[PDB]
Every structure is written in C-alpha cells, then in structure tokens.
Amino acid sequence: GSAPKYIEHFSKFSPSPLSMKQFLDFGSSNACEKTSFTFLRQELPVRLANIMKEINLLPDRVLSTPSVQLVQSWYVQSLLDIMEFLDKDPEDHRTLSQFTDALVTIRNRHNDVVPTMAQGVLEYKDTYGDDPVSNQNIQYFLDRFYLSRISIRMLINQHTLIFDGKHIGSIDPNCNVSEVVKDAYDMAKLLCDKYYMASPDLEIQEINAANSKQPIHMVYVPSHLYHMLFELFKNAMRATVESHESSLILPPIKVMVALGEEDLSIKMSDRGGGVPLRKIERLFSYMYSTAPGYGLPISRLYAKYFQGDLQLFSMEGFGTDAVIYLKALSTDSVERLPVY
Amino acid sequence: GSAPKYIEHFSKFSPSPLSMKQFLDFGSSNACEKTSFTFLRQELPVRLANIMKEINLLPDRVLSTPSVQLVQSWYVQSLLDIMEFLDKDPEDHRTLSQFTDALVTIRNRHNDVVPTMAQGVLEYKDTYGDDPVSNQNIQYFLDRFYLSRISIRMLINQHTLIFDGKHIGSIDPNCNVSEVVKDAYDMAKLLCDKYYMASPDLEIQEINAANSKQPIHMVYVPSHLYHMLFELFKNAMRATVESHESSLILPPIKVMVALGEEDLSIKMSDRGGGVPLRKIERLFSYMYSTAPGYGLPISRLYAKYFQGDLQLFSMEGFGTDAVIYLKALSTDSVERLPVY
Ligand SMILES: Cc1ccc2c(n1)[nH]c1c(C3CC3)cccc12
Ligand SMILES: Cc1ccc2c(n1)[nH]c1c(C3CC3)cccc12
Ligand SMILES: [Cl-]
Ligand SMILES: [Cl-]
C-alpha cells in the first residue's frame, strides 16, 4: 500500500495548464506520441494526486460516505495504473500501446462519477440538511472536482483520439460556431417534440465585428460547446413550451454569435416567462438542483475551462438570456485548473 | 470631548431597516411628526455611529489621510447635532422645527462627501498602488459607506420633505416607470446633443405579465430610479455615438420594462460595440474607475438599497445590456443596510 505516499509526493507539484497551441503541437503528428506519453505519465499523477489530496481533506462525515469512498477508490486505482509506466521505455512501441489502453480503461472506470456524486449530495441533504454554509462548501468542492475531471478527460481524449494507429483529436481548429448551435438545437428539438408535441423555432444572427461578411470560426472543442448549448436549449425550450400551453403563438429561441477582439460570445434568448432574480443562483447550485440534474453548473465549468464563462440573466414575466463567453484567440485559450 | 463615547454606545445597536409600508405610515400625515422625531433622534445616531466605528477601524495609512479625517469630522459634528435633541420634549413645536432645521444642515454638510472620497481613492492609488487586494478592501468599505449614506439621506429627506409646515416625500406610491425612463433619456439626450451633435432614439417596450394592457406602476423613490437610469443612458449614448462615428445609422437605445410576480425589471440595451468580459468588473470598481466617476457603482447601490440589483452583460463587437432589478411589491421593498 503506497497510495498515500504517491498522493503526498505528486500533490507537491502544481498541475501544468496547456494552451490551445500546445494541444495542437502535441496532436500535430503521430511522431509526438512519445512526447505525449512522457508528459502524461507525469502530469496525470500530478492532477490526480492534487484532487485526491483535497478529497482526503473533506470532513469525516463526507469522506466516510459510500459515494466518496467509491470515487476515491477509482482515483486510487487509476493513479496506480499510471505509475506502472513511469519506469517503462518510451522507445518501446508496446509501452505506448499499453499506455493508451490503460488510459481508455481509466476513462471508462470514471464514467459514472457525476451521478455518483449527485447521490452523495442527496444523501448529505437528507442526513445533515441544506443550509447555506453546506451549499457553499459543496459548491466549492464540486466545482473544483468537476473542473479537474474535465481537464483530465481532455488530456486522455487528446492522446487516445490522435495516437490510435483537419480535426486534432477533440479540437476543431476551424470550428463553425453556428453549425454547433444548429446541431444542439436540432437534438433539443427532437426531444422537445417527443415530450411536448411542439417546439420553438431557431433564429441565429452572427455579428463579426472585424469582418462583417465572414462566418465566425474559432479554435475550440466542439463537444464542449455542444454540451453547453444543448443544456441551454433544453431549458429554453421547456420554459418556452410550458409557459405557452394555453397560447397558440410559440416564440422562437434567438441565438446571437458575436466575434470581438478578444471575446467570442453566444447569447441564447427565450420568452419562457422568466425567473425571479432570487431564484437565479439556485439554478447553478449542486445542492439546490438535487432532488429525490447538474447540466447548468457543469456547463459553466466547460465554459470556464478555457478562460470563458457562462452567465444567466432573466426578466421575470418575459424571458431569459444566457451568454456563453469564450476566448476568441487561441493564444488566450489556456486550461483553467483548480488552484491548489 | 464625548464623541468616542457616543460612537461606542450607539454602535452597540443594530440599525432598524424600514419597509415601504413603514415609510408610508411615517409620512401618512403631519400628525406623525412627533413619532418621526422620536424615531429619528435614536435611529440616526445608531446609523451614524455604526459607520463611524467602521471608519475608525480602517488602517492608519487610510484613517490618517486628510480626506478621511475631513469626512469623519463631518460625521462627528452631525452626530453631536442630533444628540442635543435626545433630552428635548417632542410636545414642544419649537423642538420639532429646530430638529428639521438641524437635519437640513447635516444633509448640506455632507453634500461633497462622494468627490471627497474619490480624492482619497486617487491619493491611495498614487501613494500605495492599485493592487487587487487594495481594490477589494476599498470596494468593500465604500459600498458599505455609500449604502449607509443613502439610507441616512433617505430618512432625512422623508422627514424634511413631509414635515415642512399623492407623493409621500420622495416616495411615489404610483410611480410610472416608463415616465421616469423617458425623463432620464431626455436629460441624457440633451447632454449628448450638446457634446456630440447626434443622439440615439429611445424605444420603450412594457411587458405586464399579469395584466397585459395595464401600464406598469410601482411604489418607489423616483429620484433613485432616475439616477440609475440617467447613469446607464449616459454610458449607452456615449458608446453608441462613438462606435458609429464613421457610420451613418445610429442604433436606438432599447428599454424593456417587465413586471413579474415579484420582480420589476428594467433592461437597457445598446449597440455601442460592447466590452470584453475581462473589463466588465472594472466598470463597477471605485479604484479602477478613479483617474487623475462613480456613477455605476453608486447606481448599483441605489438598486440594492431596497433589495434590488443592477447587472451588466456585454457582447464585445455588438453591444451591452444593463438590467435594473427592483422588487415589484411594497411588502418586499425593505431597506438594505450594511451588516455590522
Ligand atoms: C422559466 C425558466 C426557468 C429556467 C430557465 C429558463 N426559463 N430559461 C433558461 C435558459 C435560457 C437560455 C436562456 C437557460 C437556463 C435555464 C433557464
Ligand atoms: C463600449 C461600452 C463601454 C461601457 C458601457 C457600454 N458600452 N455600455 C454601457 C451601458 C449600457 C446600458 C447598457 C451601461 C454601463 C456601461 C456601459
Ligand atoms: Cl472522475
Ligand atoms: Cl456622507
């Protein structure tokens, strides 16, 4: 049993956040597999150890619960799996293939962590209550835990996608934002029609300030952008349809994509009746969003992961706006990791 | 010299926040002058003492500066002026008249406190720097100091306006929000034309969710609402005109007034080119807004004073939205005072 020793050792290192350029360089060609392996066999234990150390610092009433113990056991095994490759020779192609297989196993091992943590939150509410102090501590920990998870899965996805034997792994250097908006809308519309037998239309407007006629493209991870937009579309469609049940006119959902000098901003606007300001905060709360999902708080973490943000503003009695803020320039797109 | 003794004694009491109903009851008729006098001769020393105690807890490098010493001297004299009436008989009409005169003198004595504090902020930046920690401490203190000042001047205005010998002092029980919007726009337009020789048009839309055809009215302090809207209009017009200097089309400023079950929300929208998210926070910072004004941070305090808020969201390359959040119901409209 060396896991506590491993956690203590690697938690002494700070994680190394990567920029988009570094991600592109790692994924530029298959010749970089050895470089990716040498980087990851060190970086992954550092990122795993730092969050694992924070987990062990949780109060005993949280640490001893089955959900936390289960998740911690997954992290311990994944940490130990990566340790086997520290002494292995990068020049051996068998080492590289085994490392890629190990990463896929690690990724699959953690697939259910989000619902597992949600179960823990519900247990905490029923076992100790839902006071504001508990909400803040849970919010602080889960935001960091999930942001850490996003960063680790990003590293694993880039290695496995690229070194399997235009797009650079999960990164699209020429991501057309409006196309991703349409994809997320279409998926949300399909679910909306199945459940409600009615769906708002989509209106997309683009504002390219520097080049008015040019479609807006960026370097980004389209799956992350899809996840944020899909979650927002689901909320906007549900609100729009339900608030107009006794009405015939169904207002469309309006999306504006704006490209500025440093911001690429996406605003989604509905006329779904709005939310009082008092209730806005609870929409992003893990504790208050638990009931006997976490789409919005996690969506905000995806936005923050590359130095962006996700903000919500409503007008009760009318409708709601959500804005995804992203960095327009790849030079400004850098991993945001929990501060340890 | 009893000022330190007075500060210590009355700082042991919590301020008593008043609701709109209590304000209306105090101002209902001239027969309440004695009740207002008995309440205020106690409440004003409590509110003055609490902020004065916080001032004395500032670090010596701030406390000893001429600006803080000047403001503190004004507070000491105003506190001493109110003390004279503690032992006086409310039944004597001369006591009531003298008390009203004393309040007017106190109000005038503090007229220049905002520019005086701004001078102190500039001195601090030049004498010690503009680090983030200094900005946060200055922001924390000034928000509380100015909110305290707003609450004290509200109490003084209600007494002096009503007991001078539809509207209840500075409170309009039937404030038409759109009329105040138009007034603030018209004033901002007049200044805009003088300086720029061009001004955006105004478009007001009202959404009365419960009663679609009814104009939106509320119980509020129209001067406070005017101050917020006027500051927002000035920023929106400046941005709109300057960003379209080399253009012929001048987009209008759009205002939506929405009345919900508990929120009355006012959104102002411009197409003034927007602000990057990174720079939004500095717009509300006293330290970063100082240069060799404070309209936005103080405007937000006016919104917060009766349990509201003022939020800003921009889309760089396009334009900016500001939303004033107010409580729709007088029962929910209660003074928000600094927590001591
Ligand atoms: C009534 C209601 C409740 C929650 C939400 C809502 N409307 N719209 C939402 C949106 C729209 C894209 C802007 C996003 C997230 C939650 C809500
Ligand atoms: C370019 C720029 C800078 C600052 C502001 C701006 N536009 N609009 C503003 C507004 C509009 C009502 C929404 C308010 C406050 C500051 C700004
Ligand atoms: Cl995980
Ligand atoms: Cl003052």
Distance CA A234, CA A228 (A): 10
CB B181 within 8 A of CB B256: no
Inter-residue contact B21 to B337 (CB < 8 Å)? no
Residue type, A105: T
Distance A211 CA to ligand 2 centre (A): 23
Q: Whole-angstrom Cα distance, residue B292 to residue B304?
A: 29
State chain B's maximal CA–CA distance in angstroms: 68
Q: Strand, helix or coil at A130?
A: coil
Give the list of residues 6+ apart from residue B98 with CB closer than 8 angstroms, or none. B85
Name the residue in chain A with its Cα closest to that of B264.
A316
Residue of A260, A278, A318 with shortest CB distance to B316? A260
CA distance A247 to A241: 9
* The pair of three-digit structure tokens given for residue B78, joined into one six-digit string: 């105003």
Q: Quote the Cα angle for A237-A243-A247, to 5°.
A: 110
In this complex, is the C-beta atom of B179 within 8 Å of any C-beta atom belonging to chain A?
no
**Beta-sheet strands, E only, within chain B:** 172-176, 202-208, 217-220, 253-259, 263-269, 309-315, 319-327
DSSP B14: P
- Catalytic residue selected from B53, B88, B234, B304: B234
Residue A57 structure tokens: 């610092």
Spell out where B270-308 has E strands: none
What are B258's strand-pairing partners? B207, B265
Query: Where does residue B330 fall: left (phi above 0), alpha (psi -120 to 50 degrees), or beta otherwise?
Result: alpha
Q: Which residues of B177-202 are buried (b: 16+ CB within 10 A; e: fewer)?
A: bbebbeebbeebbeebeeeeeebbeb
Q: Are A162 and A168 in contact (CB under 8 A)?
A: yes
Q: In angstroms, how far apart are the furthest CA atoms of chain A?
A: 68
Q: Report the sign of the C-alpha dihedral through residues B140, B143, B146, B148, in that order.
A: negative
Is B256 in the A-facing interface, judged by CB distances under 8 Å?
yes
Instruction: Report the C-alpha gap between A274 and A243 in whole angstroms.
Output: 9
Please state, in angstroms and rounded to a whole number, the distance separating the CA atoms of residues A175 and A167. 9
Residues of chain A in contact with residue B306, where contact means CB-CB under 8 angstroms, are none
Measuring CA to CA, how many Å separate B246 from each of B88, B195, B200, B241, B243? Answer: 67, 17, 15, 10, 8
User: Which structure tokens are listed for B33?
Assistant: 């002058």
CA distances from B91 to A158, B99, B155, B165 (A): 83, 13, 21, 16
User: Does B16 appear as a known binding residue?
Assistant: no
* B277 touching A (Cβ < 8 Å): yes
**What's the gap in Å between the CA of A265 and the closest CA on chain B?**
6
B277–A325 CB contact, under 8 Å: yes
User: Chain A closest CA to B276's CA: distance in Å?
Assistant: 6
CA distance A331 to B91: 74
Q: Are the beta carbons of B40 and B159 closer than 8 angstroms?
A: yes
Contact B316 A261 (CB under 8 A): yes
CA separation for the pair A220, A170 (Å, rounded): 8
- Measured from the CB, is residue B295 less than 6 Å from ligand 2? no
Distance CA B323, CA A323 (A): 14
A213 burial type by CB count under 10 A (0-12 exposed, 13-18 middle, 19+ buried):
exposed
Cα(A202)–Cα(A186) distance, rounded to whole angstroms? 9
Q: Which CATH number applies to B2-162: 3.40.47.10, 1.20.140.20, 3.20.20.10, 1.10.1040.10?
A: 1.20.140.20
Q: In angstroms, rounded to a whole number, what is the distance separating the alpha carbons of residues A192 and A200?
A: 9
Expressed in angstroms and rounded, the spacing between residue A113 Cα and the centre of ligand 3 is: 5
- Ligand 4 centroid–CA B82 distance in Å is 15
CA distances from residue A122 to A110, A115, A117, A143, A282 in whole angstroms, order as listed:
20, 11, 9, 17, 15
| CA B15 centroid distance within chain | 18
Using alpha carbons, select from B174, B153, B177, B175 the residue that is nearest to residue B229. B177
Bridge-based pairing state of the strands B309-315 and B319-327: antiparallel
Q: How many CB atoms lie within 10 A of CB A7?
A: 22
Query: Which residue of A264, A316, A324, A332 to mutate against B (max B Cβ within 10 Å)?
Result: A316
- Residue A90: closest CA among A128, A139, A36, A34: A34
3-state secondary structure A71-126: HHHHHHHHHHHHHCCCCCCCCCHHHHHHHHHHHHHHHHHCCCHHHHHHHHHHHHHH
For residue A338, give every residue at least 6 positions away whose Cβ sits within 8 Å of its Cβ, in sequence order, or none: A50, A51, A54, A144, A147, A148
- Alpha carbon B36 to chain centroid distance? 22
Task: Count CB atoms within 10 A of the CB of residue A268.
Answer: 24
Cα separation, A143 vs A180, in Å, equals 25
Fold match flag (A2-162 vs A172-332): no
CA A320 / ligand 1 centre spacing (Å): 6
B33 is catalytic: no
Q: Which residues of B touch A273 (CB under 8 A)?
A: 209
Q: After which residues is chain A broken (C to N over 2.5 A)?
A: 165, 292
Q: Is the CB of B236 under 6 A from ligand 2?
A: yes
Measure the CA–CA gap between A119 and A291, rounded to whole angstroms. 10
Determine how many CB atoms are found less than 10 A away from the CB of residue A126: 11
CA distance B93 to A158: 83
B318 contacts A207? CB cut-off 8 A: yes
Amino acid identity of A112?
Answer: D
Which of A205, A264, A277, A329 to mutate to test binding with chain B, by most B CBs within 10 Å of its CB? A277
Residue A252 DSSP one-character state: P
Helix B132-162 vs helix B93-109: angle between axes, to the nearest 10 degrees?
A: 150
A163 is in an annotated binding site: no
Residue A16 to residues A75, A156, A303, B149, Cα–Cα distance (Å)? 19, 15, 19, 48
| Ligand having the closest approach to the CA of B73 | 4
The answer to whether B239 is a known ligand-binding residue is: no
A59, A86 Cβ separation under 8 angstroms? no
**B275 neighbors B318 (Cβ within 8 angstroms):** no
User: Measured between CB atoms, does A262 come within 8 Å of chain B?
Assistant: yes
Tokens, residue A197: 């037998």
Phi-psi bin for A164: left (phi > 0), alpha (psi -120 to 50), beta?
alpha
Place of tokens 């119980």: B219
Task: Determine the Cα–Cα distance for residues A211 and A199; give it in Å rounded to an integer.
Answer: 33
Question: Per the annotation, does B237 bind a ligand?
Answer: yes
Helix axis angle for A222-243 and A295-305, nearest 10°, is 140
Helix (H, G, I), strand (E, B) or coil at B114: helix
CA of B312 to the centre of ligand 2 (A): 8
Helix B295-305 / helix B132-162 crossing angle, nearest 10 deg: 60
Check if B194 is active-site.
no
Pairwise CA distance, residues B232 & B296, whole Å = 8
Residue B265 forms contact with A (CB below 8 Å): yes
Q: Quote the CA–CA distance of A140 and A338 in Å, as a whole number.
A: 10
Give CA–CA dist B143/B135, Å, rounded.
12
Rounded to 5 degrees, what are φ and ψ at A339?
-85, 120
Cα A77 from chain centre: 23
**Are B261 and A210 inside 8 Å of each other by CB?**
no
Angle between helix A93-109 and A33-56 (nearest 10): 30
CA distances from B168 to A127, B164, B165, B306 (A): 51, 12, 14, 17
What is the rounded CA–CA span in Å between residue B315 and residue A322?
Answer: 12
Find out whether B107 is annotated in a ligand binding site: no
Q: How close is the Cα of A87 to the center of ligand 3, in Å?
A: 25
Question: Residue B213, CB half-sphere, CA atoms under 13 Å: how many?
Answer: 0
**Architecture of the B172-332 domain:** 2-Layer Sandwich (3.30)
Which ligand is nearest the CA of A315, by number?
Answer: 1
CA distance A140 to A286: 10
Return the amino acid letter for A164: D
Q: Which chain B residues are closer than 8 Å to A321 by Cβ? A: 313, 321
**Any chain B CB within 8 A of the CB of A329?**
no
B270 lines ligand 2 (CB under 6 A): yes
Q: What DSSP element (H or E) covers A275?
A: none
- Residue extents of the structural domains in chain A: 2-162, 172-332
Nearest to B24 by CA among B234, B199, B170: B170
Length of chain B: 340
Inter-chain residue contact A321 with B313, CB threshold 8 Å: yes
What kind and span of H or E run contains B261? none
DSSP track, A20-44: HHHHHHHTS-GGGHHHHHHHHHHHH
Is B103 a pocket residue for ligand 2 (Cβ < 6 Å)?
A: no
Told to judge if A231 belongs to the known catalytic residues of this protein, a careful annotator would answer: yes
Q: How does DSSP assign A41-71, residue by residue?
A: HHHHHHHHHHHHHHHHTS-HHHHTSHHHHHH
The chain A residue lying nearest B321, using CA atoms, is: A313
Q: Check B43, B110, B135, B235 and give the catalytic one.
A: B235
Kindly list the residues from chain B whose CB atom is less than 8 angstroms away from the CB atom of residue A208. Answer: 317
CB-based contact, A334 to chain B, within 8 Å = no
Location of structure tokens 């105003």: B78
Q: Give the DSSP per-residue string, B207-248.
A: EESSSTTSPPEEEE-HHHHHHHHHHHHHHHHHHHHHHTTT-S
CB B311 within 8 A of CB B325: yes
Count CB-CB contacts under 10 A for residue A292. 5
CA of A235 to the centre of ligand 1 (A): 5
The Cα–Cα gap between A126 and A133 comes to 15
Q: Which of B208, B203, B216 is nearest to B175 (CA)?
A: B216
Region of residue A65 (phi > 0: left; psi between -120 and 50: alpha; otherwise: beta): beta
The verdict on whether A245 is a catalytic residue reads no
Q: Is B147 annotated as a binding-site member?
A: no
Q: Is B206 on the interface with A (CB under 8 A)?
A: no
- Output the CA torsion B51→B53→B58→B61 (10° steps): 110
Q: Give the other-Cβ count within 10 Å of A296's Cβ.
A: 20
Quote the CA–CA distance of A147 and A337 in Å, as a whole number: 7
Confirm or reject contact between B315 and chain A (CB < 8 A): yes
- CA pair distance B274, B319, nearest whole angstrom: 4
Contacts of B54 (CB under 8 A, 6+ apart): B141, B144, B145, B338, B340
The Cα B193–Cα B196 span in angstroms is 5
CB B273 within 8 A of CB B314: no
> Quick one: tokens of B92?
């004597």
| Mutation choice for ligand 2 from B314, B321, B323, CB with most ligand atoms inside 8 A | B314
Do residues A323 and B318 lie in contact, with contact meaning Cβ atoms separated by under 8 Å?
Answer: no
Contact in structure between B88 and B95 (CB atoms under 8 Å) = yes
Closest to B296 (Cα-Cα) out of B243, B227, B207, B238: B227
**Which strands sit side by side in the sheet containing A202-208, from one edge to the other?**
A202-208, A253-259, A263-269, A319-327, A309-315
